[model samples]
Target: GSSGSSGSTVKRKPVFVKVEQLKPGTTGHTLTVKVIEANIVVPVTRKTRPASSLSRPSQPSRIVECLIGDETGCILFTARNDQVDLMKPGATVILRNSRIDMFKGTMRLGVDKWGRIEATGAASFTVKEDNNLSLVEYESGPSSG
Candidate 1:
């Protein structure tokens, strides 16, 4: 199958995921997704930024944003509030139960008490540069993208 080809297949690692796969309140099946696109944004530093006298964060922390996708589609999510700006547009990550906020009749993903986020595992996620495929692919679910 190699006619002096210029491409190689990159294997993706498997990631363990447990999430509610149905309606917002109801429960559904727990499934795993192969990350197609990832945008990682994490805290660059811990330097304290001056806060307003009236409003200040309740705790010391770092923030991060990630755009993770499976066969279905991509979801925009932030692991932290302040780290939204530090992440770029194309990075791979593994997210769990990230909060889903309704914005203008749309749902957005972000970190909250119910959400857990972390780096993608080597055995669970794989990254490959495929020029033949479209940037955003679709799986078998309804998505915001």
Candidate 2:
């Protein structure tokens, strides 16, 4: 491998896991899931970050929290601007860039621009017994609830 490639893609894959296995804070990993429903709509800013990091991409993002699930549990797939129309209830995909964003004391599964949602085709599994993960509220690390 050469040294000066800044915009190159790495040949790598994150460990995929079930919903109940997801890290409970502002962190996460890839997961397999099928959409159970799509409805919650949240606006841009949770808020502006500290003024010191002036170069960060604090540009607001609008998202719709579409609840999705599978074995172990159900969680919302909060899609950014590019994926709203692309996601539909009952559609299945191998989600990339999975991260848990805590808001309203509830957790959300959101993917970033660096990640991709492999919604190539709908899933066949019935997603039997959807487990709602975010319906429960939790507080950790003592920052904000």
Model 1 ranges with Cα > 4 A deviation: 1-66, 81-91, 122-145
Clashing pairs in 1: 13-124, 13-125, 14-123, 14-124, 15-124, 38-91, 39-91, 41-87, 71-139, 72-139
Q: Which candidate ranks first by TM-score, i.e. highest? A: 2
* Reference-based TM-score, model 1: 0.38
Give per-residue lDDT, candidate 1, residue 82: 45
| CA lDDT, every model vs. true structure | 0.39, 0.65
Model 1 lDDT, residue 75, Cα: 46
Residue 46 shift from truth in candidate 1, angstroms: 26
Q: Estimate each model's TM-score.
A: 0.38, 0.61
- Candidate topping lDDT: 2
Q: Over all chains combined, what TM-score does candidate 2 have?
A: 0.61
Per-residue accuracy of model 1 over 64-124 as CA lDDT, tens digit each: 4344444434444444544343233343444455544543233334456664545444324
